[PDB]
Amino acid sequence: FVNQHLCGSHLVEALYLVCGERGFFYTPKT
Amino acid sequence: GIVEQCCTSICSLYQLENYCN
């Protein structure tokens, strides 16, 4: 699922799955 | 940032993991 174009909710979901209990930051403007 | 690297080009695990806490 990581090695492709990941946009919008699809990107969020990938971050959620990979990062697990660490959580993550989603900063589309930066 | 993430959109340029993972949405408008192909993402990688290496890159995703930079956004984990």
CA dihedral A24, A9, A2, A29 (to 10 degrees): -60
Domain boundaries, chain A: 1-30
Name which of B13, B2, B15, B9 is nearest A28 in CA terms: B2
Distances from the Cα of A3 to the Cαs of A17, A25, B7, in angstroms?
A: 14, 19, 11
Q: How far is A13 from chain B (nearest CA, A)?
A: 11
CB A26 within 8 A of CB A9: no
Give the alpha-carbon dihedral of B15, B7, A27, B19, to 10 degrees. -20
Radius of gyration of chain A from its Cα atoms, rounded to whole angstroms: 9
Calculated CA dihedral for residues A21, B3, A8, B12, nearest 10 degrees: -50
Contact of B1 with A6, CB cutoff 8 Å? no
What was the structure determination method?
X-ray
Which of A3, A19, A27 has its CB closest to that of B11? A3
Q: Can you say how many angstroms the Cα of residue B2 is from the centroid of all Cα atoms in its chain?
A: 5
Spatial CB neighbours of B14, under 8 Å, sequence gap ≥ 6 = none
- Give the H/E segment covering residue A9: helix A9-19
| Annotated resolution, angstroms | 1.6
